[PDB]
């Protein structure tokens, strides 16, 4: 293993929109952060992208410390929510195809070699590796196409 320090954030402009996400892997010595962004799309992918890239880029099964203010992460991961699409081939009980699932099960393959676990601190009740991941989710939001 070795405590790894993902912290994340996603940042959109509009319903959908363009947003940009960014991931920062806090090392034992020295960080790395990973910004990409989608011109039309929604916070939640954008929150969600984020989470996955950061796990994605990680050959080395660690511990984890995953960090997000996503409103729509922590309702999945607490509430017995994902639990139940899993089960169901990506199914919302009610018989339809749950939203985003694209994206639901990537996440899932993600976090496979590792152990995650996650920080629902709202927003910046974390530390000012915070700021970093904030900024640069903004910042890729707004250098888009607005189309």
């Known amino acids: 293993?070795?405590?790894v320090a993902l912290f994340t954030d996603?940042?959109?402009l509009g319903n959908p929109g363009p947003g940009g996400w960014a991931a920062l892997l806090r090392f034992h010595a020295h960080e790395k952060l990973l910004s990409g962004g989608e011109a039309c799309t929604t916070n939640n992918r954008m929150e969600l992208k984020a989470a996955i890239e950061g796990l994605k880029a990680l050959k080395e099964p660690?511990?984890?410390d995953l960090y997000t203010d996503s409103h729509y992460l922590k309702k999945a991961f607490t509430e017995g929510w994902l639990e139940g699409w899993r089960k169901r081939g990506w199914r919302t009980a009610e018989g339809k195809p749950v939203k985003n699932r694209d994206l639901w099960e990537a996440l899932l393959?993600?976090?496979?070699?590792?152990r995650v676990r996650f920080?629902?601190?709202?927003?910046?009740?974390?530390?000012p590796e915070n700021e970093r991941v904030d900024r640069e989710a903004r910042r890729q939001a707004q250098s888009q196409?607005?189309?």
Do not use: N, S
């Open 109 to 114: 393959l993600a976090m496979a070699p590792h």
């Open 119 to 127: 920080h629902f601190v709202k927003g910046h009740t974390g530390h």
């Open 145 to 147: 196409a607005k189309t």
């Open 62 to 64: 660690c511990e984890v």
């Open 1 to 3: 293993r070795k405590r």
């Open 10 to 12: 996603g940042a959109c």
